[PDB]
Subunit: 243 residues, 2 copies
């Protein structure tokens, strides 16, 4: 694969520099009524010669090996902020540990955000739990974002529940729960006790909860019945260009 590295490498580099990434939008909706959307998660895709889509699951890895993940983040950031002037809907954008660990990258982000202060309300940046900063830089990060008027969320949440307490300082916009803790909850009640604990803690600190990766009407009903704020997943069609 000495070569494959070259193929992908020569691929992504040009995609970063030429803006070959397409903007795709996954609806995140209300558990109580899935016809109500809360905001749209923003996804990045690539188009093959045929026009077919290429998911990040197939190219992120390559971005990681090359250490260009920051490089993307920013392309999406600017590209999105640009997209957002055409409308007045709420968006959620992905942020990568790669971009956070790199001081130069952040500062870039803040420089960008500064140019688009008017879109603070409508843009929530999401970072993953799995790949998360130390306590100190995290509180700093939210401060920097509060000053600029932007919201921060966590996703893939659930494994670092132990840290639930430090989240209050912050003022996260919401908490997106890893869909693994929700999978077949309809037929595996042992899973609900965990969720409850979350709600009782989240509710406690006025943090809304969104259920990630809901794939079946069964899971939807119990989430609805347990009263979580939000829901997203395959169960609501595929993501898609801005229609």
């Amino acid at each position: 694969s000495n070569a494959d590295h070259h193929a992908w490498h020569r691929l992504l580099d040009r995609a970063l520099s030429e803006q070959h990434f397409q903007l795709y939008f996954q609806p995140v909706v209300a558990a109580r009524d899935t016809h109500l959307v809360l905001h749209y998660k923003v996804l990045s895709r690539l188009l093959d010669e045929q026009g077919q889509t290429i998911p990040a699951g197939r190219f992120l890895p390559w971005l990681e090996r090359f250490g260009w993940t920051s490089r993307l983040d920013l392309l999406m950031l600017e590209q999105v902020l640009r997209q957002m002037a055409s409308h007045e809907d709420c968006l959620a954008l992905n942020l990568s540990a790669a971009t956070l660990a790199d001081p130069h990258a952040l500062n870039r982000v803040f420089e960008i955000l500064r140019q688009h202060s008017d879109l603070g309300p409508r843009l929530t940046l999401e970072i993953g739990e799995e790949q998360l900063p130390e306590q100190a830089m995290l509180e700093q990060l939210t401060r920097r974002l509060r000053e600029l008027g932007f919201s921060l969320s966590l996703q893939r949440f659930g494994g670092r529940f132990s840290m639930i307490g430090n989240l209050a300082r912050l003022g996260l916009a919401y908490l997106k729960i890893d869909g693994s803790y929700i999978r077949d909850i309809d037929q595996e009640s042992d899973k609900r006790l965990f969720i409850e604990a979350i709600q009782r803690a989240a509710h406690s600190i006025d943090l809304p909860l969104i259920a990630e990766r809901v794939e079946t009407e069964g899971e939807l009903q119990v989430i609805r019945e347990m009263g979580l704020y939000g829901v997203q997943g395959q169960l609501f069609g595929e993501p898609a260009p801005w229609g």
Copy 2:
């Protein structure tokens, strides 16, 4: 270290076959009154020529590399059950993933337990969360132990909180919380929110909670104030032969 392997190897093998392990007892006590003991955790030590002690932290690793961890478990088991006839106090014994993954080992354990049915009430076997069996074998395990009249506990608990729900089926005697979630709780309030969630879930299923590794009077007070059942740690002297 090609040699060190031989040194330790020729060491432990003889200790397993000759019974060179010494029985040591760490008191686990009531949070509300540390003069009340609930049971004694059982520890295994080795004696150097001088008489000084040798903690498992220094020999377990070697036992792992050689795959003799099961081999020990059973030595302790029998040795302990033997110790227990001389008294009427409650004991807690360590059980290793190594022994659980090995069908032959278990069966040995059950064969041993069968010979000492009269000591069911007084012996609680503890297994760690970190190193834990799949769901199916776990429920089977407790069944096998219920039939024989012995109690099971979890320790190092907290990281796999997500599994809290499946614990009800079981009938664990107690839940021993990893002392990492308790460290400087006196001065780090962000830690208490996590504990609360635990209590509200544990209490929910009538599972008592014990705080592992309490090292300071500060930690003790907040645990006491939050109302956890049990406490153990360096703060209550060193372990020791049966006095």
